Scaffold this active site. Structure first.
Site, mmCIF file in Angstrom:
data_model
loop_
_atom_site.group_PDB
_atom_site.id
_atom_site.type_symbol
_atom_site.label_atom_id
_atom_site.label_comp_id
_atom_site.label_asym_id
_atom_site.label_seq_id
_atom_site.Cartn_x
_atom_site.Cartn_y
_atom_site.Cartn_z
ATOM 1 N N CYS A 106 -4.564 -9.499 2.700
ATOM 2 C CA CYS A 106 -4.625 -8.468 3.384
ATOM 3 C C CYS A 106 -4.533 -8.960 4.983
ATOM 4 C CB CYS A 106 -5.964 -7.765 3.281
ATOM 5 S SG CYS A 106 -6.448 -5.999 4.295
ATOM 6 N N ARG A 109 -7.434 -7.824 8.204
ATOM 7 C CA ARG A 109 -8.967 -8.234 8.103
ATOM 8 C C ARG A 109 -9.695 -8.362 9.278
ATOM 9 N NH1 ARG A 109 -8.951 -13.324 4.388
ATOM 10 N NH2 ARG A 109 -6.589 -13.118 4.503
ATOM 11 N N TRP A 278 -5.620 1.911 7.222
ATOM 12 C CA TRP A 278 -4.412 2.568 7.656
ATOM 13 C C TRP A 278 -3.091 1.883 7.598
ATOM 14 C CZ3 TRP A 278 -8.425 1.581 10.972
ATOM 15 C CH2 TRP A 278 -8.321 0.329 11.806
ATOM 16 N N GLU A 283 5.346 -1.157 5.354
ATOM 17 C CA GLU A 283 4.907 -0.949 4.049
ATOM 18 C C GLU A 283 5.729 0.383 3.539
ATOM 19 O OE1 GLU A 283 0.660 -1.584 3.015
ATOM 20 O OE2 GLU A 283 0.053 -1.189 5.109
HETATM 21 C C1 HEM Z 1 -7.293 -0.819 8.131
HETATM 22 C C2 HEM Z 1 -6.111 -1.178 8.171
HETATM 23 C C3 HEM Z 1 -5.444 -1.910 7.010
HETATM 24 C C4 HEM Z 1 -4.271 -2.798 7.079
HETATM 25 C C5 HEM Z 1 -3.539 -2.729 8.368
HETATM 26 C C6 HEM Z 1 -4.297 -3.489 5.868
HETATM 27 C C7 HEM Z 1 -2.863 -4.271 5.471
HETATM 28 C C8 HEM Z 1 -2.673 -4.965 4.265
HETATM 29 C C9 HEM Z 1 -1.286 -5.070 3.845
HETATM 30 C C10 HEM Z 1 -0.041 -4.814 4.537
HETATM 31 C C11 HEM Z 1 -1.498 -5.432 2.475
HETATM 32 C C12 HEM Z 1 0.000 -6.007 1.666
HETATM 33 C C13 HEM Z 1 -0.132 -4.986 0.524
HETATM 34 C C14 HEM Z 1 1.280 -4.856 0.334
HETATM 35 O O1 HEM Z 1 2.180 -5.502 0.943
HETATM 36 O O2 HEM Z 1 1.780 -4.412 -0.807
HETATM 37 C C15 HEM Z 1 -2.984 -5.476 2.341
HETATM 38 C C16 HEM Z 1 -3.302 -5.952 1.068
HETATM 39 C C17 HEM Z 1 -4.660 -5.841 0.785
HETATM 40 N N1 HEM Z 1 -5.802 -5.348 1.628
HETATM 41 FE FE1 HEM Z 1 -5.414 -4.381 3.183
HETATM 42 N N2 HEM Z 1 -5.235 -3.374 4.989
HETATM 43 C C18 HEM Z 1 -6.211 -2.279 5.696
HETATM 44 C C19 HEM Z 1 -7.435 -2.144 5.255
HETATM 45 C C20 HEM Z 1 -7.835 -2.764 4.172
HETATM 46 C C21 HEM Z 1 -9.365 -2.421 3.475
HETATM 47 C C22 HEM Z 1 -10.135 -1.325 4.045
HETATM 48 C C23 HEM Z 1 -9.676 -2.979 2.623
HETATM 49 C C24 HEM Z 1 -10.659 -3.230 1.457
HETATM 50 C C25 HEM Z 1 -11.829 -2.460 1.676
HETATM 51 C C26 HEM Z 1 -8.414 -3.859 2.363
HETATM 52 C C27 HEM Z 1 -8.049 -4.854 1.305
HETATM 53 C C28 HEM Z 1 -6.881 -5.412 0.880
HETATM 54 C C29 HEM Z 1 -6.729 -5.821 -0.424
HETATM 55 C C30 HEM Z 1 -7.677 -6.317 -1.467
HETATM 56 C C31 HEM Z 1 -5.049 -6.497 -0.636
HETATM 57 C C32 HEM Z 1 -4.649 -6.969 -1.786
HETATM 58 C C33 HEM Z 1 -4.294 -5.913 -2.780
HETATM 59 C C34 HEM Z 1 -3.490 -6.351 -3.670
HETATM 60 O O3 HEM Z 1 -3.413 -7.546 -4.318
HETATM 61 O O4 HEM Z 1 -3.135 -5.534 -4.462
HETATM 62 N N3 HEM Z 1 -7.468 -3.641 3.270
HETATM 63 N N4 HEM Z 1 -3.654 -5.023 3.286
HETATM 64 C C1 LIG Z 2 -6.087 -1.248 2.173
HETATM 65 C C2 LIG Z 2 -4.539 -1.187 2.145
HETATM 66 C C3 LIG Z 2 -4.082 -0.547 3.594
HETATM 67 C C4 LIG Z 2 -2.756 -0.522 3.578
HETATM 68 N N1 LIG Z 2 -2.096 -0.406 4.934
HETATM 69 N N2 LIG Z 2 -1.792 -1.130 2.696
HETATM 70 C C5 LIG Z 2 -2.333 -1.498 1.490
HETATM 71 C C6 LIG Z 2 -1.422 -2.049 0.415
HETATM 72 C C7 LIG Z 2 -1.695 -2.288 -0.695
HETATM 73 C C8 LIG Z 2 -0.949 -2.444 -1.751
HETATM 74 N N3 LIG Z 2 -1.353 -3.136 -3.140
HETATM 75 C C9 LIG Z 2 -0.463 -2.689 -4.183
HETATM 76 C C10 LIG Z 2 0.369 -4.088 -4.359
HETATM 77 C C11 LIG Z 2 0.814 -4.332 -5.827
HETATM 78 C C12 LIG Z 2 0.215 -3.484 -6.755
HETATM 79 C C13 LIG Z 2 0.328 -3.456 -7.997
HETATM 80 C C14 LIG Z 2 1.538 -4.137 -8.474
HETATM 81 C C15 LIG Z 2 1.907 -4.243 -9.759
HETATM 82 N N4 LIG Z 2 2.213 -4.168 -10.733
HETATM 83 C C16 LIG Z 2 2.260 -4.887 -7.600
HETATM 84 C C17 LIG Z 2 1.861 -4.844 -6.155
HETATM 85 C C18 LIG Z 2 -3.199 -2.288 -1.008
HETATM 86 C C19 LIG Z 2 -4.083 -1.904 0.006
HETATM 87 C C20 LIG Z 2 -3.587 -1.454 1.214
HETATM 88 CL CL LIG Z 3 1.771 2.092 -0.244
#
Ligand code: HEM
Ligand SMILES: Cc1cc(N)nc2cc(CNCCc3ccc(C#N)cc3)ccc12
Ligand SMILES: [Cl-]
Ligand code: HEM
Ligand SMILES: Cc1cc(N)nc2cc(CNCCc3ccc(C#N)cc3)ccc12
Ligand SMILES: C[C@H](O)[C@H](O)[C@H]1CNc2nc(N)[nH]c(=O)c2N1
Ligand SMILES: C[C@H](O)[C@H](O)[C@H]1CNc2nc(N)[nH]c(=O)c2N1
Ligand SMILES: [Cl-]
Ligand SMILES: [Gd]
Ligand SMILES: [Gd]
Ligand SMILES: [Gd]
Ligand SMILES: [Zn+2]
Lengths: 402, 404
Positions: A106, A109, A278, A283
């Protein structure tokens, strides 16, 4: 002993001392690296809880008071009696934040401190489940000015099944298979769409039909619930200076709300704890719209741009993709819905790395996920070395309940 | 055996080759350090054992392992070792080894080419100016008037009792970087610390942004000696954009021959401290990293202004827009100049094919995901959605301390 990490843009060097405290093993060994893989009793439940309680009582600079040691022996007493234990409300707010703080993939953070935690551990049915969720969505959306929230439903507990949200996200678009093998709507959601329908849902015909919710109460079948149209805020996509763009009919929703991951705190596990922040424009623009296996509009955009799609060296994909991102950023700002571009996002992620090195002596990050899917080396995270590892509390993947 | 998935298609392969990966990298169950640039730690015993499997790898490769022919070659590489402590590779083995090290290079995206490599045997070399002569044949052959050709030149193998052959420049062709009044740099800041090492090793420094450096060469246990490449030997490309007429006036150029010269070639337990190689550029190496990296030439903002973009707000994606055009200009220029270059889509797609080839041949392919994915438009190229396993095979190209 601890890893030497280097920023290659500036030439600064840290040592990640937080790493030695990593609590679970990842996929890598001395002989092979698998960082690129997407998917890598009371004695034990106790040693994790004691570790969580230790954490919690430190972040309130109350380490070794006797609120602390009272709370320790309280916990093993209750594990002794019942095999588990219940988090206090404050402990749960801390633990949920920590899990965000600890998430390696993420880039958002910097915000981890400002999380709204909704305690729904007293939920009892799927109908009440729905209600907690609808309230979450309304709060987090906030008419466009987005807020970070998590809703925590009842922990896993022996003798009763799990609360589960079947949907990967609270808001997703249907994916209707054809017999061409071709898909209408989002192809990533073909499986959930077929489930919904089998559970009595009347499907649509559009490329952007919002899916119902499949909610599971313990030892019950999943129950379908239609989100109210006016609760799901959406953004029609148009381009600042390519006016034919709006005629593509593209839309995306405001709230990214992940609903299928497990929250792990002090040994306890929350199979249902949806959270949301958000979007980062990449994405939506790159992955959701350009991925060949998602909506796949790239070639269509580029042809319309009258780019030369018959050769790669004309860089038509890169030009089209950049415009698609511009359109997303502009569409969301037009509609006054919160959104962050990859430059600002990574920029703030770099201030997070600095904050974290001061606080905990390091920060877990997965380089391949932190780096944007376009314009990597233009962003400052690219030239930054990173150490990936698992701290707890945390969000984990978990199997699909069907 | 590691399960490797492709997420664009859904295909699954098992990397059985990772099991022969015997030198250990930087990662552990507890942490991952695959993003580290240098995983740097930087007797007869098993030099023997390092030679016996190389030899056998070689004979399996020319399907004559266990046969007779395999006999004697095995049946005293070790007298060479017994008598004098080291052995010498017969030329076929030096060709094979060189090609394997390229084939096993995890960070190199162009390995579809690994079977086309010209090997120049400079092992009879003994003086710095003999070395400098071997280098100039290399450049001349590799450049080939712009129709570039993969080449490597192997100088003598290190041995205790004498010094190393060591080329001191990081590449054969490099632009000087001059420290400034401002503590700033004029030229390439990457090459700051080789420039002054050249400067009063005699070199009379130039005044410019693009002054091609002199080669500092080192024959065993002696001090280095300076050499000016002849201008005619260094082929360069002036950079022009196919539609933005003002771009040419920025006066940017880049050389044609990527030729790395400070890595250590390891074959069969023998180490070759000086062994330069060269192929051709992928456009993003010039466009995005050399020209746009904030710590390199740092030109991105300049091009944005000329394109009349809004640089007051990141959300305009002016960085993204400027970078694409710089790249279009790199590709265009090299083609106009009939100099061999490859775009990042073409390269990556060819590397997927290499992977599939390698699955069938050796049951896997060591590949560093972070270095294979291009540094612009990653998710747009096939290699992005492909899981990869990174591990160290031998023969292999390794890093090494700088000889000063
Ligand atoms: C507030 C604005 C936020 C932004 C801009 C953001 C951004 C991102 C992005 C771009 C990713 C990559 C996911 C992807 O590319 O598919 C990600 C992953 C992740 N984020 Fe955030 N996030 C936000 C809020 C949060 C919140 C509120 C949480 C938890 C309560 C969180 C926890 C996580 C977790 C656990 C992942 C990994 C998910 C996975 O591996 O499937 N994020 N985040
Ligand atoms: C909080 C949050 C915010 C944000 N802007 N974007 C966010 C995107 C994610 C994206 N996680 C999904 C990534 C994924 C999941 C499942 C599989 C499979 N199979 C492959 C890839 C999670 C949380 C987000
Ligand atoms: Cl999405
Ligand atoms: C002929 C076409 C070639 C292409 C398109 C190509 C492409 C690349 C690229 C893009 C990199 C990334 C390095 C960086 O960006 O800093 C790289 C690195 C590398 N290449 Fe290839 N290369 C080619 C030829 C060769 C040859 C001929 C060899 C060996 C004989 C080779 C072996 C290597 C090695 C060992 C690295 C690692 C460099 C490092 O670790 O710093 N390549 N190559
Ligand atoms: C054969 C070859 C071909 C090609 N097209 N490009 C190629 C690029 C390289 C790039 N190697 C240098 C990358 C580097 C070097 C030093 C440090 C440090 N400190 C950090 C990074 C090497 C060989 C190449
Ligand atoms: C296989 C590949 O590593 C995988 O698809 C990853 C790459 N990096 C990513 N990074 C982010 N932020 N999100 C993703 O979905 C992915 N996908
Ligand atoms: C920290 C990070 O691994 C580092 O900056 C790497 C990323 N990938 C790279 N890949 C290539 N080919 N060249 C590079 O210089 C880098 N830089
Ligand atoms: Cl270079
Ligand atoms: Gd227009
Ligand atoms: Gd159409
Ligand atoms: Gd102008
Ligand atoms: Zn690793």
């Amino acid at each position: 002993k601890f890893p030497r990490v280097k920023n290659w843009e500036v030439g600064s060097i840290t040592y990640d001392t937080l790493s030695a405290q990593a609590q679970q093993d990842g996929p890598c060994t001395p002989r092979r690296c698998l960082g690129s893989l997407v998917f890598p009793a009371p004695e034990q439940l106790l040693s994790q809880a004691r570790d969580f309680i230790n954490q919690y009582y430190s972040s309130i600079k109350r380490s070794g008071s006797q609120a602390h040691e009272q709370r320790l022996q309280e916990v093993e007493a209750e594990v002794a009696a019942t095999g588990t234990y219940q988090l206090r409300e404050s402990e749960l707010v801390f633990g949920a934040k920590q899990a965000w703080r600890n998430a390696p993939r993420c880039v958002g953070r910097i915000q981890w401190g400002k999380l709204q935690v909704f305690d729904a551990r007293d939920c009892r049915s799927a109908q009440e489940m729905f209600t907690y969720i609808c309230n979450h969505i309304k709060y987090a959306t906030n008419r466009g000015n987005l807020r970070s929230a998590i809703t925590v439903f009842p922990q896993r507990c022996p003798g009763r099944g799990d609360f589960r949200i079947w949907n990967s996200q609270l808001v997703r678009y249907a994916g209707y298979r054809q017999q061409d093998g071709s898909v209408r709507g989002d192809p990533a959601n073909v499986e959930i769409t077929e489930l919904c329908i089998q559970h009595g849902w009347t499907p649509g015909n559009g490329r952007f039909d919002v899916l119902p919710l499949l909610l599971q109460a313990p030892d019950e079948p999943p129950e379908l619930f239609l989100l109210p149209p006016e609760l799901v805020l959406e953004v029609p996509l148009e381009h600042p200076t390519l006016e034919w763009f709006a005629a593509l009919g593209l839309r995306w929703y405001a709230l990214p709300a992940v609903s299928n991951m497990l929250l792990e705190i002090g040994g306890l596990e929350f199979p249902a704890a949806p959270f949301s922040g958000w979007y980062m424009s990449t994405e939506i623009g790159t992955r959701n719209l350009c991925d060949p296996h998602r909506y796949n509009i790239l070639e269509d955009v580029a042809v319309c741009m009258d780019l030369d799609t018959r050769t790669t060296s004309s860089l038509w994909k890169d030009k089209a993709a950049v415009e698609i991102n511009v359109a997303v950023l502009h569409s969301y700002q037009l509609a006054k819905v919160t959104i962050v571009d990859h430059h600002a996002a990574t920029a703030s992620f770099m201030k997070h790395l600095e904050n974290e090195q001061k606080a905990r002596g390091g920060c877990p990050a997965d380089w391949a996920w932190i780096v944007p899917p376009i314009s990597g080396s233009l962003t400052p995270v690219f030239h930054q070395e990173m150490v990936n590892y698992f701290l707890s509390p945390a969000f984990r993947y978990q199997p699909d309940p069907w």
